[PDB]
Amino acid sequence: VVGGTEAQRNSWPSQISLQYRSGSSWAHTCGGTLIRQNWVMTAAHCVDRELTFRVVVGEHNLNQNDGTEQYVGVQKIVVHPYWNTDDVAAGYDIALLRLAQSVTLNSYVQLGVLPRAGTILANNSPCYITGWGLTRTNGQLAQTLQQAYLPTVDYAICSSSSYWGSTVKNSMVCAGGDGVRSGCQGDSGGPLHCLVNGQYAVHGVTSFVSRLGCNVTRKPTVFTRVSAYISWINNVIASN
Ligand SMILES: *C(=O)[C@@H](C(C)C)[C@H]1[C@H](NS(C)(=O)=O)CCN1C(=O)/C=C/CN1CCCCC1
């Protein structure tokens, strides 16, 4: 997250760190949202690789013991069937991960609430992106979880020529684009938390940014629109 602030450790308990095995260690690669004690929602682009993954819940600092973490392996991965790795702009950037064990819930570990199917936010709706992604374009990952306020940019504005044009589809949510704040590499797969009727819900799964950089004016961060996938998510959890 570029231009973020450190999140309080109990503000976003559904946020998880998705990591892969690298040598004798684990490397953070993406964010994700805990949706069931044994299921995590992330981006397809985070797991369409030949790696061994684990999820860390109750994670605040990737490099220090927080004393609240639960480390769990990923048992099964279900990527959206229309996903195409070399065509993120087509959409379908979503995947569900079934965990090897069910995690224990507490103030640092909670299920993320998803919007009702079809829900679209009004332009400039208040949301926060969270994650450990780069803190600057071509920079380095954050050690502590960061958050940045990114109000939404509706489909009509987002798909206009000075914004993203037709690269953005109606199955996506755009947010930010102020040139200072944004998601960045390593934030992909994580949540876009939006406040609606007093409660935060995860309306987006971080998917992509501009080729020019993370925080680019009029190139808001783009997310898979969760509300376009409620039936898909329900179908997967039920058949697995
Ligand atoms: C996730 O971290 C994203 C954004 C949110 C930073 C990032 C990831 N790239 S990487 C180097 O961490 O593997 C996954 C894809 N991604 C992108 O920004 C992809 C952008 C690609 N463009 C191609 C042109 C059409 C729009 C998307």
PDB file of C-alpha atoms and ligand atoms in Angstrom:
ATOM      1  CA  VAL A   1       0.000   0.000   0.000  1.00  0.00           C
ATOM      2  CA  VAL A   2       1.456   3.307  -1.135  1.00  0.00           C
ATOM      3  CA  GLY A   3       0.605   6.266   1.098  1.00  0.00           C
ATOM      4  CA  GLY A   4      -0.852   4.167   3.841  1.00  0.00           C
ATOM      5  CA  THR A   5      -0.686   4.337   7.631  1.00  0.00           C
ATOM      6  CA  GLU A   6      -0.050   1.434   9.961  1.00  0.00           C
ATOM      7  CA  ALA A   7      -3.287  -0.379  10.750  1.00  0.00           C
ATOM      8  CA  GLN A   8      -4.152  -0.988  14.362  1.00  0.00           C
ATOM      9  CA  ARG A   9      -3.651  -4.752  14.901  1.00  0.00           C
ATOM     10  CA  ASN A  10      -7.343  -5.355  15.609  1.00  0.00           C
ATOM     11  CA  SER A  11      -8.945  -3.184  12.896  1.00  0.00           C
ATOM     12  CA  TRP A  12      -9.077  -5.729  10.073  1.00  0.00           C
ATOM     13  CA  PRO A  13      -9.183  -9.223  11.548  1.00  0.00           C
ATOM     14  CA  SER A  14     -10.309 -10.899   8.287  1.00  0.00           C
ATOM     15  CA  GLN A  15      -7.110  -9.863   6.505  1.00  0.00           C
ATOM     16  CA  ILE A  16      -4.651 -12.710   5.954  1.00  0.00           C
ATOM     17  CA  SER A  17      -1.118 -12.991   4.547  1.00  0.00           C
ATOM     18  CA  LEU A  18      -0.793 -15.571   1.737  1.00  0.00           C
ATOM     19  CA  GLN A  19       2.719 -16.939   1.624  1.00  0.00           C
ATOM     20  CA  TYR A  20       4.643 -19.455  -0.451  1.00  0.00           C
ATOM     21  CA  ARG A  21       7.535 -21.715   0.474  1.00  0.00           C
ATOM     22  CA  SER A  22      10.855 -20.407  -0.756  1.00  0.00           C
ATOM     23  CA  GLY A  23      14.012 -22.249   0.258  1.00  0.00           C
ATOM     24  CA  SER A  24      13.858 -22.857   4.005  1.00  0.00           C
ATOM     25  CA  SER A  25      11.510 -19.926   4.540  1.00  0.00           C
ATOM     26  CA  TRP A  26       8.144 -18.469   3.661  1.00  0.00           C
ATOM     27  CA  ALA A  27       7.589 -15.419   1.506  1.00  0.00           C
ATOM     28  CA  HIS A  28       4.540 -13.139   1.630  1.00  0.00           C
ATOM     29  CA  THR A  29       3.056 -12.933  -1.876  1.00  0.00           C
ATOM     30  CA  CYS A  30      -0.489 -11.620  -1.520  1.00  0.00           C
ATOM     31  CA  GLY A  31      -3.358 -10.694   0.686  1.00  0.00           C
ATOM     32  CA  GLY A  32      -6.601 -12.634   1.196  1.00  0.00           C
ATOM     33  CA  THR A  33      -9.825 -12.440   3.275  1.00  0.00           C
ATOM     34  CA  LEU A  34     -10.831 -15.129   5.728  1.00  0.00           C
ATOM     35  CA  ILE A  35     -14.463 -15.997   4.838  1.00  0.00           C
ATOM     36  CA  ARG A  36     -15.035 -19.278   6.731  1.00  0.00           C
ATOM     37  CA  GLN A  37     -12.867 -20.698   9.499  1.00  0.00           C
ATOM     38  CA  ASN A  38     -11.409 -22.914   6.771  1.00  0.00           C
ATOM     39  CA  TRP A  39     -11.795 -20.839   3.606  1.00  0.00           C
ATOM     40  CA  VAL A  40      -9.915 -17.811   2.287  1.00  0.00           C
ATOM     41  CA  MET A  41     -10.897 -15.595  -0.615  1.00  0.00           C
ATOM     42  CA  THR A  42      -8.024 -14.240  -2.709  1.00  0.00           C
ATOM     43  CA  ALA A  43      -7.103 -13.349  -6.302  1.00  0.00           C
ATOM     44  CA  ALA A  44      -6.685 -16.096  -8.892  1.00  0.00           C
ATOM     45  CA  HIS A  45      -3.478 -14.343  -9.996  1.00  0.00           C
ATOM     46  CA  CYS A  46      -1.993 -15.032  -6.512  1.00  0.00           C
ATOM     47  CA  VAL A  47      -2.331 -18.808  -6.789  1.00  0.00           C
ATOM     48  CA  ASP A  48      -2.132 -19.700 -10.487  1.00  0.00           C
ATOM     49  CA  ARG A  49       1.492 -20.770  -9.855  1.00  0.00           C
ATOM     50  CA  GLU A  50       3.257 -24.040  -9.028  1.00  0.00           C
ATOM     51  CA  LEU A  51       3.966 -23.253  -5.408  1.00  0.00           C
ATOM     52  CA  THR A  52       3.218 -24.494  -1.907  1.00  0.00           C
ATOM     53  CA  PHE A  53       1.115 -21.955  -0.009  1.00  0.00           C
ATOM     54  CA  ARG A  54       0.182 -21.251   3.553  1.00  0.00           C
ATOM     55  CA  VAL A  55      -2.038 -18.654   5.123  1.00  0.00           C
ATOM     56  CA  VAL A  56      -1.257 -16.658   8.196  1.00  0.00           C
ATOM     57  CA  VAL A  57      -4.158 -15.260  10.213  1.00  0.00           C
ATOM     58  CA  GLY A  58      -3.686 -12.926  13.187  1.00  0.00           C
ATOM     59  CA  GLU A  59      -0.719 -11.476  11.356  1.00  0.00           C
ATOM     60  CA  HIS A  60       0.376  -7.876  11.939  1.00  0.00           C
ATOM     61  CA  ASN A  61       4.141  -7.779  11.263  1.00  0.00           C
ATOM     62  CA  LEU A  62       5.547 -10.134   8.648  1.00  0.00           C
ATOM     63  CA  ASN A  63       8.983 -10.010  10.205  1.00  0.00           C
ATOM     64  CA  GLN A  64       8.242 -10.150  13.944  1.00  0.00           C
ATOM     65  CA  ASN A  65       6.393 -12.426  16.275  1.00  0.00           C
ATOM     66  CA  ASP A  66       3.075 -10.694  17.097  1.00  0.00           C
ATOM     67  CA  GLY A  67       2.002 -13.355  19.549  1.00  0.00           C
ATOM     68  CA  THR A  68      -1.378 -13.674  17.766  1.00  0.00           C
ATOM     69  CA  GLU A  69      -0.599 -15.601  14.606  1.00  0.00           C
ATOM     70  CA  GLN A  70      -2.004 -18.931  13.411  1.00  0.00           C
ATOM     71  CA  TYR A  71      -0.095 -20.543  10.510  1.00  0.00           C
ATOM     72  CA  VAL A  72      -2.114 -22.936   8.347  1.00  0.00           C
ATOM     73  CA  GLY A  73      -1.400 -24.777   5.134  1.00  0.00           C
ATOM     74  CA  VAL A  74      -3.566 -24.525   2.052  1.00  0.00           C
ATOM     75  CA  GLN A  75      -5.228 -27.860   1.299  1.00  0.00           C
ATOM     76  CA  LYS A  76      -7.191 -27.093  -1.856  1.00  0.00           C
ATOM     77  CA  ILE A  77      -7.299 -24.260  -4.375  1.00  0.00           C
ATOM     78  CA  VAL A  78     -10.303 -23.418  -6.536  1.00  0.00           C
ATOM     79  CA  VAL A  79      -9.614 -20.736  -9.117  1.00  0.00           C
ATOM     80  CA  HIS A  80     -12.493 -19.183 -11.011  1.00  0.00           C
ATOM     81  CA  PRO A  81     -12.909 -21.413 -14.074  1.00  0.00           C
ATOM     82  CA  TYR A  82     -12.925 -18.513 -16.574  1.00  0.00           C
ATOM     83  CA  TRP A  83      -9.702 -17.029 -15.205  1.00  0.00           C
ATOM     84  CA  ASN A  84      -6.832 -16.589 -17.705  1.00  0.00           C
ATOM     85  CA  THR A  85      -3.464 -15.697 -16.189  1.00  0.00           C
ATOM     86  CA  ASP A  86      -2.383 -13.618 -19.142  1.00  0.00           C
ATOM     87  CA  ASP A  87      -5.651 -11.671 -19.346  1.00  0.00           C
ATOM     88  CA  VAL A  88      -6.273 -10.084 -15.921  1.00  0.00           C
ATOM     89  CA  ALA A  89      -8.279  -7.336 -17.703  1.00  0.00           C
ATOM     90  CA  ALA A  90     -10.948  -9.855 -18.684  1.00  0.00           C
ATOM     91  CA  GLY A  91     -11.776 -10.217 -14.992  1.00  0.00           C
ATOM     92  CA  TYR A  92     -12.533 -13.442 -13.034  1.00  0.00           C
ATOM     93  CA  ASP A  93      -9.549 -12.665 -10.730  1.00  0.00           C
ATOM     94  CA  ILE A  94     -10.786 -14.644  -7.752  1.00  0.00           C
ATOM     95  CA  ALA A  95      -9.987 -17.912  -6.024  1.00  0.00           C
ATOM     96  CA  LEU A  96     -10.935 -19.747  -2.863  1.00  0.00           C
ATOM     97  CA  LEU A  97      -8.506 -21.602  -0.682  1.00  0.00           C
ATOM     98  CA  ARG A  98      -9.625 -24.396   1.631  1.00  0.00           C
ATOM     99  CA  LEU A  99      -7.312 -24.477   4.668  1.00  0.00           C
ATOM    100  CA  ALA A 100      -5.832 -27.647   6.192  1.00  0.00           C
ATOM    101  CA  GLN A 101      -7.316 -26.734   9.568  1.00  0.00           C
ATOM    102  CA  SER A 102     -10.076 -24.449  10.797  1.00  0.00           C
ATOM    103  CA  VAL A 103      -8.635 -21.376  12.506  1.00  0.00           C
ATOM    104  CA  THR A 104      -9.735 -20.123  15.904  1.00  0.00           C
ATOM    105  CA  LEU A 105     -11.594 -16.798  15.951  1.00  0.00           C
ATOM    106  CA  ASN A 106     -10.743 -13.913  18.302  1.00  0.00           C
ATOM    107  CA  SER A 107     -10.193 -10.179  18.046  1.00  0.00           C
ATOM    108  CA  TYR A 108      -7.353 -10.666  15.577  1.00  0.00           C
ATOM    109  CA  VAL A 109      -9.080 -13.366  13.512  1.00  0.00           C
ATOM    110  CA  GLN A 110     -12.633 -12.911  12.215  1.00  0.00           C
ATOM    111  CA  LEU A 111     -14.636 -13.777   9.144  1.00  0.00           C
ATOM    112  CA  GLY A 112     -14.973 -11.012   6.595  1.00  0.00           C
ATOM    113  CA  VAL A 113     -18.506 -10.012   5.754  1.00  0.00           C
ATOM    114  CA  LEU A 114     -19.335 -10.000   2.032  1.00  0.00           C
ATOM    115  CA  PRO A 115     -21.945  -7.734   0.379  1.00  0.00           C
ATOM    116  CA  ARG A 116     -25.250  -9.056  -0.863  1.00  0.00           C
ATOM    117  CA  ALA A 117     -25.112 -10.227  -4.485  1.00  0.00           C
ATOM    118  CA  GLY A 118     -25.262  -7.447  -7.050  1.00  0.00           C
ATOM    119  CA  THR A 119     -24.469  -4.617  -4.649  1.00  0.00           C
ATOM    120  CA  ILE A 120     -22.814  -1.598  -6.281  1.00  0.00           C
ATOM    121  CA  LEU A 121     -21.463   1.299  -4.282  1.00  0.00           C
ATOM    122  CA  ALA A 122     -22.266   4.904  -4.981  1.00  0.00           C
ATOM    123  CA  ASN A 123     -19.409   6.912  -6.423  1.00  0.00           C
ATOM    124  CA  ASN A 124     -16.895   8.113  -3.868  1.00  0.00           C
ATOM    125  CA  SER A 125     -17.986   5.574  -1.256  1.00  0.00           C
ATOM    126  CA  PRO A 126     -15.636   5.321   1.730  1.00  0.00           C
ATOM    127  CA  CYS A 127     -13.283   2.343   1.693  1.00  0.00           C
ATOM    128  CA  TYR A 128      -9.904   1.258   2.969  1.00  0.00           C
ATOM    129  CA  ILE A 129      -7.474  -1.028   1.174  1.00  0.00           C
ATOM    130  CA  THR A 130      -5.266  -3.085   3.513  1.00  0.00           C
ATOM    131  CA  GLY A 131      -2.099  -5.029   2.907  1.00  0.00           C
ATOM    132  CA  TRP A 132       1.621  -5.589   3.172  1.00  0.00           C
ATOM    133  CA  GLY A 133       2.347  -4.701  -0.465  1.00  0.00           C
ATOM    134  CA  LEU A 134       5.053  -2.306  -1.634  1.00  0.00           C
ATOM    135  CA  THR A 135       5.005   1.073   0.048  1.00  0.00           C
ATOM    136  CA  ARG A 136       6.207   2.789  -3.157  1.00  0.00           C
ATOM    137  CA  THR A 137       6.081   1.881  -6.849  1.00  0.00           C
ATOM    138  CA  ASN A 138       9.033  -0.543  -7.370  1.00  0.00           C
ATOM    139  CA  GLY A 139       9.665  -0.333  -3.612  1.00  0.00           C
ATOM    140  CA  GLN A 140       9.575  -2.914  -0.847  1.00  0.00           C
ATOM    141  CA  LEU A 141       6.968  -4.730   1.151  1.00  0.00           C
ATOM    142  CA  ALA A 142       5.714  -3.267   4.350  1.00  0.00           C
ATOM    143  CA  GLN A 143       6.654  -4.991   7.594  1.00  0.00           C
ATOM    144  CA  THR A 144       3.415  -3.919   9.378  1.00  0.00           C
ATOM    145  CA  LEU A 145      -0.079  -4.134   7.914  1.00  0.00           C
ATOM    146  CA  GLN A 146      -0.956  -0.871   6.166  1.00  0.00           C
ATOM    147  CA  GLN A 147      -4.254   0.737   5.323  1.00  0.00           C
ATOM    148  CA  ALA A 148      -5.133   3.558   2.938  1.00  0.00           C
ATOM    149  CA  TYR A 149      -8.392   5.419   2.407  1.00  0.00           C
ATOM    150  CA  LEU A 150      -9.467   4.876  -1.221  1.00  0.00           C
ATOM    151  CA  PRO A 151     -12.949   6.121  -2.057  1.00  0.00           C
ATOM    152  CA  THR A 152     -14.616   4.330  -4.923  1.00  0.00           C
ATOM    153  CA  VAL A 153     -14.723   5.550  -8.514  1.00  0.00           C
ATOM    154  CA  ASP A 154     -17.927   4.233 -10.135  1.00  0.00           C
ATOM    155  CA  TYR A 155     -17.971   2.139 -13.280  1.00  0.00           C
ATOM    156  CA  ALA A 156     -19.116   5.051 -15.432  1.00  0.00           C
ATOM    157  CA  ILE A 157     -16.184   7.242 -14.415  1.00  0.00           C
ATOM    158  CA  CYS A 158     -13.680   4.443 -14.115  1.00  0.00           C
ATOM    159  CA  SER A 159     -14.302   3.142 -17.575  1.00  0.00           C
ATOM    160  CA  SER A 160     -14.055   6.624 -19.104  1.00  0.00           C
ATOM    161  CA  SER A 161     -11.094   7.473 -21.395  1.00  0.00           C
ATOM    162  CA  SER A 162      -8.972   9.510 -18.965  1.00  0.00           C
ATOM    163  CA  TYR A 163      -9.369   6.761 -16.357  1.00  0.00           C
ATOM    164  CA  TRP A 164      -9.117   3.076 -17.346  1.00  0.00           C
ATOM    165  CA  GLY A 165     -11.291   2.996 -20.429  1.00  0.00           C
ATOM    166  CA  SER A 166     -12.500  -0.441 -21.420  1.00  0.00           C
ATOM    167  CA  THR A 167      -9.760  -2.172 -19.439  1.00  0.00           C
ATOM    168  CA  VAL A 168     -12.145  -2.009 -16.446  1.00  0.00           C
ATOM    169  CA  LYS A 169     -15.245  -4.230 -16.613  1.00  0.00           C
ATOM    170  CA  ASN A 170     -18.483  -4.035 -14.682  1.00  0.00           C
ATOM    171  CA  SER A 171     -17.342  -7.035 -12.640  1.00  0.00           C
ATOM    172  CA  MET A 172     -14.715  -4.847 -11.067  1.00  0.00           C
ATOM    173  CA  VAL A 173     -14.575  -2.137  -8.465  1.00  0.00           C
ATOM    174  CA  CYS A 174     -12.284   0.884  -8.827  1.00  0.00           C
ATOM    175  CA  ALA A 175     -11.061   2.877  -5.854  1.00  0.00           C
ATOM    176  CA  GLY A 176      -8.594   5.690  -5.266  1.00  0.00           C
ATOM    177  CA  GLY A 177      -6.613   7.136  -8.150  1.00  0.00           C
ATOM    178  CA  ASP A 178      -5.556  10.279  -6.230  1.00  0.00           C
ATOM    179  CA  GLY A 179      -1.896   9.858  -7.194  1.00  0.00           C
ATOM    180  CA  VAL A 180      -0.744   9.456  -3.557  1.00  0.00           C
ATOM    181  CA  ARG A 181      -2.626   6.407  -2.183  1.00  0.00           C
ATOM    182  CA  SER A 182      -2.995   2.990  -3.762  1.00  0.00           C
ATOM    183  CA  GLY A 183      -2.521  -0.760  -3.621  1.00  0.00           C
ATOM    184  CA  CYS A 184       0.856  -2.025  -4.911  1.00  0.00           C
ATOM    185  CA  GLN A 185       2.562  -5.381  -5.580  1.00  0.00           C
ATOM    186  CA  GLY A 186       1.983  -7.758  -2.689  1.00  0.00           C
ATOM    187  CA  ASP A 187      -1.483  -6.268  -1.919  1.00  0.00           C
ATOM    188  CA  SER A 188      -3.157  -8.321  -4.681  1.00  0.00           C
ATOM    189  CA  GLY A 189      -5.696 -10.798  -3.367  1.00  0.00           C
ATOM    190  CA  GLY A 190      -6.434  -8.737  -0.264  1.00  0.00           C
ATOM    191  CA  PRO A 191      -9.571  -6.846   0.669  1.00  0.00           C
ATOM    192  CA  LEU A 192     -11.113  -3.484  -0.165  1.00  0.00           C
ATOM    193  CA  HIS A 193     -13.225  -2.795   2.998  1.00  0.00           C
ATOM    194  CA  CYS A 194     -16.133  -0.434   2.366  1.00  0.00           C
ATOM    195  CA  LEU A 195     -18.403   1.184   4.939  1.00  0.00           C
ATOM    196  CA  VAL A 196     -22.081   0.770   4.187  1.00  0.00           C
ATOM    197  CA  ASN A 197     -24.873   1.348   6.642  1.00  0.00           C
ATOM    198  CA  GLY A 198     -22.387   1.489   9.504  1.00  0.00           C
ATOM    199  CA  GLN A 199     -20.563  -1.746   8.881  1.00  0.00           C
ATOM    200  CA  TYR A 200     -17.485  -2.571   6.821  1.00  0.00           C
ATOM    201  CA  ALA A 201     -17.852  -5.288   4.177  1.00  0.00           C
ATOM    202  CA  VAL A 202     -15.259  -6.659   1.746  1.00  0.00           C
ATOM    203  CA  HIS A 203     -16.390  -5.344  -1.608  1.00  0.00           C
ATOM    204  CA  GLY A 204     -13.223  -5.965  -3.522  1.00  0.00           C
ATOM    205  CA  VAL A 205     -10.338  -8.393  -4.057  1.00  0.00           C
ATOM    206  CA  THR A 206      -7.228  -6.386  -5.084  1.00  0.00           C
ATOM    207  CA  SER A 207      -6.395  -7.202  -8.711  1.00  0.00           C
ATOM    208  CA  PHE A 208      -4.371  -4.644 -10.659  1.00  0.00           C
ATOM    209  CA  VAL A 209      -2.723  -1.240 -11.022  1.00  0.00           C
ATOM    210  CA  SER A 210      -1.320   0.912 -13.848  1.00  0.00           C
ATOM    211  CA  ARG A 211       1.747  -0.052 -15.849  1.00  0.00           C
ATOM    212  CA  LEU A 212       2.987   3.436 -14.995  1.00  0.00           C
ATOM    213  CA  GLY A 213       3.051   2.671 -11.295  1.00  0.00           C
ATOM    214  CA  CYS A 214       0.956   2.010  -8.221  1.00  0.00           C
ATOM    215  CA  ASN A 215      -0.160   5.486  -7.238  1.00  0.00           C
ATOM    216  CA  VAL A 216      -0.995   7.085 -10.564  1.00  0.00           C
ATOM    217  CA  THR A 217      -3.542   9.870 -10.908  1.00  0.00           C
ATOM    218  CA  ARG A 218      -6.734   8.751 -12.582  1.00  0.00           C
ATOM    219  CA  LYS A 219      -5.616   5.089 -12.497  1.00  0.00           C
ATOM    220  CA  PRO A 220      -7.385   3.946  -9.314  1.00  0.00           C
ATOM    221  CA  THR A 221      -6.557   0.539  -7.963  1.00  0.00           C
ATOM    222  CA  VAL A 222      -8.784  -2.099  -9.573  1.00  0.00           C
ATOM    223  CA  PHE A 223     -10.458  -4.923  -7.659  1.00  0.00           C
ATOM    224  CA  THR A 224     -12.600  -7.914  -8.498  1.00  0.00           C
ATOM    225  CA  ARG A 225     -16.147  -6.952  -7.451  1.00  0.00           C
ATOM    226  CA  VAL A 226     -17.008  -9.436  -4.714  1.00  0.00           C
ATOM    227  CA  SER A 227     -20.751  -8.925  -5.087  1.00  0.00           C
ATOM    228  CA  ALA A 228     -20.589 -10.215  -8.663  1.00  0.00           C
ATOM    229  CA  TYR A 229     -19.336 -13.547  -7.294  1.00  0.00           C
ATOM    230  CA  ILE A 230     -21.567 -14.438  -4.360  1.00  0.00           C
ATOM    231  CA  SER A 231     -23.252 -17.389  -6.114  1.00  0.00           C
ATOM    232  CA  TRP A 232     -19.881 -18.649  -7.326  1.00  0.00           C
ATOM    233  CA  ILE A 233     -18.402 -18.450  -3.845  1.00  0.00           C
ATOM    234  CA  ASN A 234     -21.409 -20.178  -2.283  1.00  0.00           C
ATOM    235  CA  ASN A 235     -21.318 -22.907  -4.947  1.00  0.00           C
ATOM    236  CA  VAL A 236     -17.672 -23.629  -4.357  1.00  0.00           C
ATOM    237  CA  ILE A 237     -17.893 -23.822  -0.584  1.00  0.00           C
ATOM    238  CA  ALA A 238     -20.914 -26.105  -0.816  1.00  0.00           C
ATOM    239  CA  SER A 239     -19.324 -28.531  -3.304  1.00  0.00           C
ATOM    240  CA  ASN A 240     -16.059 -28.688  -1.327  1.00  0.00           C
TER     241      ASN A 240
HETATM  242  C1  LIG B   1      -1.260  -7.198  -7.166  1.00  0.00           C
HETATM  243  O1  LIG B   1      -0.385  -7.120  -6.328  1.00  0.00           O
HETATM  244  C2  LIG B   1      -1.379  -6.358  -8.436  1.00  0.00           C
HETATM  245  C3  LIG B   1      -1.547  -4.815  -8.193  1.00  0.00           C
HETATM  246  C4  LIG B   1      -2.787  -4.702  -7.266  1.00  0.00           C
HETATM  247  C5  LIG B   1      -0.303  -4.230  -7.520  1.00  0.00           C
HETATM  248  C6  LIG B   1      -0.265  -6.776  -9.433  1.00  0.00           C
HETATM  249  C7  LIG B   1       0.361  -8.150  -9.211  1.00  0.00           C
HETATM  250  N1  LIG B   1       1.583  -8.094  -9.982  1.00  0.00           N
HETATM  251  S1  LIG B   1       2.942  -8.846  -9.307  1.00  0.00           S
HETATM  252  C8  LIG B   1       4.312  -8.246 -10.051  1.00  0.00           C
HETATM  253  O2  LIG B   1       2.929  -8.665  -7.818  1.00  0.00           O
HETATM  254  O3  LIG B   1       2.789 -10.394  -9.691  1.00  0.00           O
HETATM  255  C9  LIG B   1      -0.545  -9.192  -9.899  1.00  0.00           C
HETATM  256  C10 LIG B   1      -0.998  -8.383 -11.147  1.00  0.00           C
HETATM  257  N2  LIG B   1      -0.762  -6.998 -10.780  1.00  0.00           N
HETATM  258  C11 LIG B   1      -0.980  -6.057 -11.727  1.00  0.00           C
HETATM  259  O4  LIG B   1      -0.911  -4.862 -11.465  1.00  0.00           O
HETATM  260  C12 LIG B   1      -1.261  -6.546 -13.127  1.00  0.00           C
HETATM  261  C13 LIG B   1      -1.388  -5.420 -14.092  1.00  0.00           C
HETATM  262  C14 LIG B   1      -1.349  -5.891 -15.543  1.00  0.00           C
HETATM  263  N3  LIG B   1      -2.124  -4.997 -16.419  1.00  0.00           N
HETATM  264  C15 LIG B   1      -1.964  -5.470 -17.830  1.00  0.00           C
HETATM  265  C16 LIG B   1      -2.717  -4.494 -18.742  1.00  0.00           C
HETATM  266  C17 LIG B   1      -4.187  -4.501 -18.393  1.00  0.00           C
HETATM  267  C18 LIG B   1      -4.421  -4.098 -16.917  1.00  0.00           C
HETATM  268  C19 LIG B   1      -3.570  -5.031 -16.056  1.00  0.00           C
END
